[PDB]
């Protein structure tokens, strides 16, 4: 998600 500092897709 957008608010996640480092999202894993």
């Amino acid at each position: 998600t957008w608010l996640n500092p480092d999202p894993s897709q």
Partner: antibody, heavy 116, light 108 residues
């Protein structure tokens, strides 16, 4: 608040090298993924590189027109983001932006001029 | 790679008027799209994230909608300060690519 301050941009001879910097404060730097975005004078925005947090082994991503030539790095101890730029070409002349995560915060940018 | 095509390239809008900027994605990008407003000599400011979420300190007149492949930003009763260049960007994979931009002028 959150701030990203760019520095290092100047005039570089073509085929030359330059390291630009981004200083971060007002947030936990070491958990956020970071990236560089550029904007040639008068043109649109082009995404250039991304670097993930330490927890995700620092995996890096680049744009094809920049690969094997620009290297994105970060010093988490000093909340610093860097961009090593080697073998600079004319088309690399741009405003370089320090962007946080996916795009929520942008730095004011440093100008890079590649001219002889 | 995903190609974002934006429309229109430029608008001449009068104060109080409402107008919509559209932006289409080559592939399906679900809802992984953001909107930016940029003012000349300045860095782009985030308007809407995940297609429909208004970012902090942004007027309620900015409405983002769309999911899948077709997206559009809407400005209700455009103010004098709403001048600038509006960009879309997807965030579904590397590289994050941008729309070609929409230059927005104030009618006078």
């Amino acid at each position: 608040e959150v701030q990203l301050v760019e520095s290092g941009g100047g005039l570089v001879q073509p085929k030359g090298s330059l390291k630009i910097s981004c200083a971060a404060s007002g947030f936990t730097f070491n958990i956020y993924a970071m990236n560089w975005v550029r904007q040639a004078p008068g043109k649109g925005l082009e995404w250039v590189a991304r670097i993930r947090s330490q927890s995700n082994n620092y995996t890096t991503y680049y744009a094809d027109s920049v690969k094997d030539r620009f290297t994105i790095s970060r010093d988490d101890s000093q909340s610093m983001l860097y961009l090593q730029m080697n073998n600079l070409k004319t088309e690399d002349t741009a405003m370089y932006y320090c962007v946080r995560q996916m795009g929520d915060y942008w730095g004011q940018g440093t100008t890079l001029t590649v001219s002889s | 790679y995903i190609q974002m095509t934006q429309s229109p390239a430029s608008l001449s809008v009068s104060v109080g008027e409402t107008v919509t900027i559209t932006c289409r994605a080559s592939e399906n990008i679900y809802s992984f799209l953001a909107w930016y407003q940029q003012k000349q000599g300045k860095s782009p400011q985030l308007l809407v994230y995940a297609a429909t979420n208004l970012a902090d300190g942004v007027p309620s007149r900015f409405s983002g909608s769309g999911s899948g492949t077709q997206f559009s930003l809407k400005i209700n009763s455009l103010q004098s300060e709403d001048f600038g260049t509006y960009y879309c960007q997807h965030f579904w994979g590397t590289p994050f690519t941008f729309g070609s931009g929409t230059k927005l002028e104030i009618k006078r």
